[PDB]
Amino acid sequence: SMGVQVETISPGDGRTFPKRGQTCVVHYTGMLEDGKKFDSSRDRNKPFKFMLGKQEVIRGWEEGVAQMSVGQRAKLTISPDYAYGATGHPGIIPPHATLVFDVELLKLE
Amino acid sequence: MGVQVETISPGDGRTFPKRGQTCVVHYTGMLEDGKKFDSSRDRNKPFKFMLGKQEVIRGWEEGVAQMSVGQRAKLTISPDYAYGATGHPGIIPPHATLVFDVELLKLE
Amino acid sequence: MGVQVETISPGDGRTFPKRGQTCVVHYTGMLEDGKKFDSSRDRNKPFKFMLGKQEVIRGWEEGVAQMSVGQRAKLTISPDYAYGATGHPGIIPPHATLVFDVELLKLE
Amino acid sequence: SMGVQVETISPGDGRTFPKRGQTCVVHYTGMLEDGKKFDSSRDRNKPFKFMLGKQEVIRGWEEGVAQMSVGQRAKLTISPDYAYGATGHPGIIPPHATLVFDVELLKLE
Amino acid sequence: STPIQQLLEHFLRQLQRKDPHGFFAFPVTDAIAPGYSMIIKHPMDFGTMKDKIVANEYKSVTEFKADFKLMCDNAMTYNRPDTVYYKLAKKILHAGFKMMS
Amino acid sequence: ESTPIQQLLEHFLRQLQRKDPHGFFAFPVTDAIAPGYSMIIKHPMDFGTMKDKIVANEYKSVTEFKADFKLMCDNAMTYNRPDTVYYKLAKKILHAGFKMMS
Amino acid sequence: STPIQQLLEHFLRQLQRKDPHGFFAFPVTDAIAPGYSMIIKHPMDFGTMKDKIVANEYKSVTEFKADFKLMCDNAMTYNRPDTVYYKLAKKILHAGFKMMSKQ
Amino acid sequence: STPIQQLLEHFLRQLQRKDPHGFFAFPVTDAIAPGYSMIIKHPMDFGTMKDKIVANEYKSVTEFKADFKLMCDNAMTYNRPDTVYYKLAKKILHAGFKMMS
Ligand SMILES: CCNC(=O)N1CCN(c2nc(NC3CCN(C(=O)[C@@H](CCc4ccc(OC)cc4)NC(=O)[C@@H]4CCCCN4C(=O)C(=O)C(C)(C)CC)CC3)nc(N(Cc3cnn(C)c3)C3CC3)n2)CC1
Numbered sequence: 001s002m003g004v005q006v007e008t009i010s011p012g013d014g015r016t017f018p019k020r021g022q023t024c025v026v027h028y029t030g031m032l033e034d035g036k037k038f039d040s041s042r043d044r045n046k047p048f049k050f051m052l053g054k055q056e057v058i059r060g061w062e063e064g065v066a067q068m069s070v071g072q073r074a075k076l077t078i079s080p081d082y083a084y085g086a087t088g089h090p091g092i093i094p095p096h097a098t099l100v101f102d103v104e105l106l107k108l109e
Numbered sequence: 110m111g112v113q114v115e116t117i118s119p120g121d122g123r124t125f126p127k128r129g130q131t132c133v134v135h136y137t138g139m140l141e142d143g144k145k146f147d148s149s150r151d152r153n154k155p156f157k158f159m160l161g162k163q164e165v166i167r168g169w170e171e172g173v174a175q176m177s178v179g180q181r182a183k184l185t186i187s188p189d190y191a192y193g194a195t196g197h198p199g200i201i202p203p204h205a206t207l208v209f210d211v212e213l214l215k216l217e
Numbered sequence: 218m219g220v221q222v223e224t225i226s227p228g229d230g231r232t233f234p235k236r237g238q239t240c241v242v243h244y245t246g247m248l249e250d251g252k253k254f255d256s257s258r259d260r261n262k263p264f265k266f267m268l269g270k271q272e273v274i275r276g277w278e279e280g281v282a283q284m285s286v287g288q289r290a291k292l293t294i295s296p297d298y299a300y301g302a303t304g305h306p307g308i309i310p311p312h313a314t315l316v317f318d319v320e321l322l323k324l325e
Numbered sequence: 326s327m328g329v330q331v332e333t334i335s336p337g338d339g340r341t342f343p344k345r346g347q348t349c350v351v352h353y354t355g356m357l358e359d360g361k362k363f364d365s366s367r368d369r370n371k372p373f374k375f376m377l378g379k380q381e382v383i384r385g386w387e388e389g390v391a392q393m394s395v396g397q398r399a400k401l402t403i404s405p406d407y408a409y410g411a412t413g414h415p416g417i418i419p420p421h422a423t424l425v426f427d428v429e430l431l432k433l434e
Numbered sequence: 435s436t437p438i439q440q441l442l443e444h445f446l447r448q449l450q451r452k453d454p455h456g457f458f459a460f461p462v463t464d465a466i467a468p469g470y471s472m473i474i475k476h477p478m479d480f481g482t483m484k485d486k487i488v489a490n491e492y493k494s495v496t497e498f499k500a501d502f503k504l505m506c507d508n509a510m511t512y513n514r515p516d517t518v519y520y521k522l523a524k525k526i527l528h529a530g531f532k533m534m535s
Numbered sequence: 536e537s538t539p540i541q542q543l544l545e546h547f548l549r550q551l552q553r554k555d556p557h558g559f560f561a562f563p564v565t566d567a568i569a570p571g572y573s574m575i576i577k578h579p580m581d582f583g584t585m586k587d588k589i590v591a592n593e594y595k596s597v598t599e600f601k602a603d604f605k606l607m608c609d610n611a612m613t614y615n616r617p618d619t620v621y622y623k624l625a626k627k628i629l630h631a632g633f634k635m636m637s
Numbered sequence: 638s639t640p641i642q643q644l645l646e647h648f649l650r651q652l653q654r655k656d657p658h659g660f661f662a663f664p665v666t667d668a669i670a671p672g673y674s675m676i677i678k679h680p681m682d683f684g685t686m687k688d689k690i691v692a693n694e695y696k697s698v699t700e701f702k703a704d705f706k707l708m709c710d711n712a713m714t715y716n717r718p719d720t721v722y723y724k725l726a727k728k729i730l731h732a733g734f735k736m737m738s739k740q
Numbered sequence: 741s742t743p744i745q746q747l748l749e750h751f752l753r754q755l756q757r758k759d760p761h762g763f764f765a766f767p768v769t770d771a772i773a774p775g776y777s778m779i780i781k782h783p784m785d786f787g788t789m790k791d792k793i794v795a796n797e798y799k800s801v802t803e804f805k806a807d808f809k810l811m812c813d814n815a816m817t818y819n820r821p822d823t824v825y826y827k828l829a830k831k832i833l834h835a836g837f838k839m840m841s
């Protein structure tokens with residue numbers, strides 16, 4: 001609806017953006033709209049890797065991370081249509097949930 | 110294409126309807142130019158049909174079959190997968206492309 | 218999901234096959250991991266089939282219908298739009314996704 | 326495939342790149358591989374306008390112009406798969422033709 | 435103006451009402467549509483048709499219909515099937531023939 | 536006693552404000568935070584001012600309320616460059632709020 | 638090595654040959670699959686099964702089949718049907734049951 | 741000409757056709773690319789490859805493919821990724837192998 005909004009927390013180089021078929025290396029924290037945390041790669045001390053263009057993540061990450069450059073830290077606010085929709089993720093994400101992720105694009109591989 | 114499916118909001122991506130199951134949907138039907146001809150939401154009552162039972166136009170039969178429970182999608186349906194040359198007198202003109210907003214709420 | 222069409226080189230974008238026309242194609246078919254199972258180019262002879270005549274798997278019927286004359290495309294076809302649970306004994310395993318490189322050469 | 330290569334003839338500002346939904350105003354000359362001209366907006370004294378993301382142009386222009394910055398003049402060499410393919414453009418561009426465009430990005434609108 | 439000029443003037447205004455954005459209002463230039471004059475050999479537009487009506491150049495309603503058809507056929511030849519121009523040309527052509535049937 | 540117009544617009548306003556969870560539109564844009572704003576934007580608007588107008592029964596119609604909401608979004612899209620969060624939110628919220636208030 | 642340990646080692650080598658990329662070789666971590674430990678309550682993998690064989694913890698071929706099924710069932714629960722992992726889990730589960738069908 | 745010389749010449753003309761502007765046509769000089777001989781230790785180019793064919797220095801197709809790869813790899817080491825040169829080297833390396841496989 002409001003799709004995905006990208007708010008910069010601290011800037012990346014503003015020139016190295018991920019293309020289709022590249023692997024993005026990120027650290028993230030995911031919270032519900034009211035701030036309760038549901039997951040964080042920082043809590044596991046291990047960055048998350050996914051490849052753009054490979055249907056691996058919710059649409060708000062696909063479109064939101066594609067807009068960031070290496071080094072950038074940003075807040076992604078993602079509407080349910082760009083997340084888990086009516087189903088949610090049983091026991092983790094409720095139905096019809098807007099999600100907020102703190103995402104840092106660490107590196108491209 | 111007879112029917113094109115564009116996702117509005119995602120379903121669970123694993124529960125797809127099989128032959129003989131009842132699909133419970135809310136829908137709005139419009140002509141290609143945006144004019145509404147019907148909506149189950151206007152009647153506060155979802156529409157039910159059983160897959161494999163020749164109850165609906167082919168664009169719904171094949172289009173809803175591609176959706177998973179919870180999904181909301183836009184179906185654009187060619188006349189051959191809809192009401193064809195006859196149309197539906199007084200409701201759908203001849204050779205009409207139809208657009209439905211469909212939400213697959215549940216299978217029964 | 219049933220058939221995905223990715224353009225390799227463009228067709229004329231206006232001449233699309235209709236019911237009862239014969240499509241003349243060169244193709245290579247591979248399994249998802251890239252192993253080839255057949256190619257008309259290896260036989261120096263294009264493959265012909267008539268649209269609307271139940272001569273081919275549904276992913277070809279619907280995938281080639283989306284191409285225009287001259288187009289070369291990669292068709293990725295799910296088992297439900299191909300040979301499904303049975304496969305094609307000794308040629309296509311059960312539950313196989315198929316990948317074809319298809320060039321629509323001409324309609325007759 | 327060789328796709329499209331962008332070679333700079335004279336530089337643009339190297340900072341203003343066209344985004345999806347912007348109108349590109351360009352002057353161009355199009356030639357076949359052997360140098361024969363088939364069209365030029367400069368010959369008509371009128372720049373060409375097209376919007377990125379709207380399927381208005383051959384893929385080599387879609388991806389090639391996206392790489393230029395305002396002010397840049399570049400030579401685009403475009404393989405047939407990124408052009409008119411087997412069909413060509415009857416009477417103007419033969420089948421299976423590699424195309425060369427001299428393109429200047431004048432302005433974004 | 436003769437009874438024929440009047441009828442064609444009526445038809446032209448009614449058809450022009452079907453083109454509120456003026457897609458058919460003036461000749462298509464090569465600047466807006468590269469290669470147009472290479473593809474379309476006999477261009478036509480409402481403005482040219484209006485000039486023909488005023489100059490009493492149409493000998494029959496049939497000749498007026500032929501330019502209208504020519505105008506639409508040029509648009510469906512030049513423009514790709516997914517474009518607004520192609521879709522409008524097909525829509526307006528059917529409506530104009532139906533009106534002047 | 537709230538008038539029917541005062542009840543409906545506050546209902547609409549709360550729905551619109553929920554679309555701005557970070558409060559970008561909550562208060563007037565100052566020149567200290569955005570130099571030259573008052574030279575560029577001649578008629579500033581924000582949710583807080585809209586709320587104040589409702590409370591003081593200044594809106595004569597829903598039409599006027601929609602016009603202030605639009606003005607707020609249009610001001611944001613004039614002042615901020617298209618690559619900013621602010622511009623993108625203003626365009627998104629303008630479309631989404633109109634859809635909601637019909 | 639008892640008669641059962643030999644047979645289970647045989648089955649394990651045959652099953653592992655069907656996983657040439659080692660998708661099932663080690664426990665799935667949360668770093669590679671976010672939320673894995675939230676969705677799958679009883680993880681299983683070939684490496685753990687091998688350790689169980691060596692420690693003579695399987696009392697029957699049936700118990701070994703139950704861990705193999707569990708491993709496949711976890712993969713088909715965690716991964717979406719369109720993923721390489723789901724398709725491999727379904728293929729190997731069928732192939733392993735067929736191989737061990739006479740138990 | 742021996743069979744190997746014929747085959748390598750056939751491949752070379754096909755590979756050179758992929759470089760119509762002649763970026764790979766001649767050795768990179770230090771005057772044109774300062775420090776090149778400090779960065780690239782074993783330079784290669786189509787012109788040297790043609791000369792190697794003519795004097796019958798290639799013992800196998802394998803050695804010829806290795807020089808083509810070296811040429812592309814030298815270009816991708818010397819030139820920055822945002823340059824026409826780097827992008828061409830990556831494109832031609834993939835396409836030439838595809839062509840000769
Ligand atoms: C077969 C045996 N084996 C096995 O099963 N498994 C396990 C799998 N597995 C695996 N998976 C992935 N990537 C994603 C795939 C999709 N996904 C997700 O979570 C998605 C949600 C599901 C989804 C998918 C597509 C989609 O489209 C529209 C919509 C939804 N989440 C998200 O979009 C967001 C944003 C990003 C972070 C998490 N999000 C969240 O909301 C959350 O916080 C949770 C999920 C906690 C709340 C709900 C799972 C993980 N990569 C790799 N590799 C290769 C490798 C393997 N081993 N090694 C050592 C390397 C590395 C090289 C890449 N391997 C192999 C082992």
Ligand SMILES: CCNC(=O)N1CCN(c2nc(NC3CCN(C(=O)[C@@H](CCc4ccc(OC)cc4)NC(=O)[C@@H]4CCCCN4C(=O)C(=O)C(C)(C)CC)CC3)nc(N(Cc3cnn(C)c3)C3CC3)n2)CC1
Binds near residue numbers: 353376467519520
């Ligand atoms: C209805 C009556 N009316 C009417 O018919 N018509 C006519 C149409 N028409 C029109 N068309 C276009 N743009 C393209 C559309 C696609 N196209 C092309 O040439 C494409 C080739 C076709 C194509 C399209 C998509 C595609 O992959 C998605 C693959 C192929 N070419 C190219 O990709 C290249 C590179 C760019 C330059 C040209 N190329 C060439 O090879 C050549 O040199 C030629 C073609 C000469 C050799 C063969 C036509 C022109 N814009 C606008 N506007 C609105 C406006 C502003 N003022 N007014 C008054 C209006 C302006 C604001 C923008 N209006 C309205 C009038």
Ligand SMILES: CCNC(=O)N1CCN(c2nc(NC3CCN(C(=O)[C@@H](CCc4ccc(OC)cc4)NC(=O)[C@@H]4CCCCN4C(=O)C(=O)C(C)(C)CC)CC3)nc(N(Cc3cnn(C)c3)C3CC3)n2)CC1
Binds near residue numbers: 559560568571621
């Ligand atoms: C959506 C509704 N809401 C809204 O719209 N709002 C409120 C939020 N929002 C905003 N903007 C900014 N700062 C920049 C944005 C870009 N810019 C400029 O002036 C530029 C000119 C425009 C420009 C920008 C980039 C560019 O090359 C990339 C080229 C041109 N000028 C200059 O480069 C110079 C240098 C010194 C300043 C003045 N210069 C001058 O020539 C002048 O003297 C003038 C301008 C008078 C002559 C022309 C505005 C200043 N910071 C914050 N915050 C968060 C916060 C804290 N409290 N609150 C409440 C919020 C704090 C954390 C920082 N929020 C936008 C307005």
Ligand SMILES: CCNC(=O)N1CCN(c2nc(NC3CCN(C(=O)[C@@H](CCc4ccc(OC)cc4)NC(=O)[C@@H]4CCCCN4C(=O)C(=O)C(C)(C)CC)CC3)nc(N(Cc3cnn(C)c3)C3CC3)n2)CC1
Binds near residue numbers: 772825829
């Ligand atoms: C594909 C096969 N082919 C190929 O690979 N080739 C052949 C084609 N090609 C090329 N390159 C250049 N110019 C630069 C490209 C960038 N660069 C440099 O050295 C830079 C260091 C790299 C760099 C670049 C940008 C940057 O921030 C944006 C940061 C770093 N150095 C310097 O900034 C300084 C300043 C003075 C000169 C040297 N400096 C030094 O410190 C030194 O002394 C050294 C380097 C020794 C110690 C560090 C190389 C040369 N021109 C042309 N031509 C066409 C032509 C063909 N034939 N003829 C007759 C003409 C015409 C225009 C002349 N062609 C690349 C090689």
